[PDB]
Point group: C3
Chain length 127, copies 3
């Protein structure tokens, strides 16, 4: 049937394997929870990292998640945009689903919450 | 019906936000003109930029295109190839469509016209 | 029919066009033979290269393979992980197939044999 991309993004405080794995895992887990995604219905996944992250391939966390051992995943370098979010891991998970495009739940965590499309910037936060 | 990739590429003269969004929008518009693509039929999109481009994520132009705000898109850095076309933006748009693979209209604009494969289906269907 | 990614990887001894095309073509042919892949059933392909490879886009091997000239493909840079495999080409081939996720045959050649899930761990018996 129809297939849909699911986006997510998250950040780490430091380029360490523990942080990259933990935050990638948490991001994937939230995407799964919000979209009700079963690993057998995942076509494939891509994860990107900004060029300030080198400790580990974030795909390791996907490969270790129980039940996800056959999900095809690979990584890539995000483009280096001047002023772009630093230490950022992004997902493109492709899933078989009947859920319409405008109801798919994309997930933005940690410092990537500023990437939510739903928000306008608050001009005065205090009064 | 089936899912198919549509490829595009374009270039800019300068690493500026207005040029990268303008040429990326024009490339998407041309893809829509030629393939008749409706945003809800797009599974997902990937945009790449050569590493001489840093001013903006080209995906911004997709996110701002009227009706396309729910199309999942993310970017990546293109490889740096010796002699590779400079200042180039490429797209891979994954869509649901019944158009056969050899009729999908891949779009090469600006200096990326040098990338077109110049295939001959008139001959390939025969010999 | 379901869509599924197929993963592959290989390596070259030298960053030359000749070796990159030779080893990418070998990798493609092996994926095709293990999965019985027909080009019209390929949605699209992505190929990544480590940042030590500049001589050619590995996608040239796909564009030049007989009957694959309408398979949409594009490339990206793999992320630079410390101690990541050097001179490595990775593939994500998206295909229409009824084969179960756990029976897809992912192909890892040359020095990328260490990326086989069943070999990646062998070193744990030794150090």
């Amino acid at each position: 049937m129809m297939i849909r991309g699911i986006r997510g993004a998250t950040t780490v405080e430091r380029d360490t394997e523990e942080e990259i794995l933990q935050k990638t895992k948490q991001l994937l887990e939230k995407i799964i929870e919000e979209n009700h995604t079963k690993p057998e219905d995942v076509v494939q996944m891509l994860l990107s990292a900004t060029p300030d992250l080198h400790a580990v391939f974030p795909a390791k966390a996907v490969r270790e998640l129980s039940g996800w051992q056959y999900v095809p995943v690979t990584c890539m370098q995000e483009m280096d945009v001047t002023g772009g979010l630093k230490k950022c891991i992004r997902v493109m998970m492709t899933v078989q689903t009947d859920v319409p495009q405008d109801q798919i739940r994309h997930v933005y965590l940690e410092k990537a919450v500023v990437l939510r499309p739903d928000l306008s910037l608050t001009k005065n936060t205090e009064l």
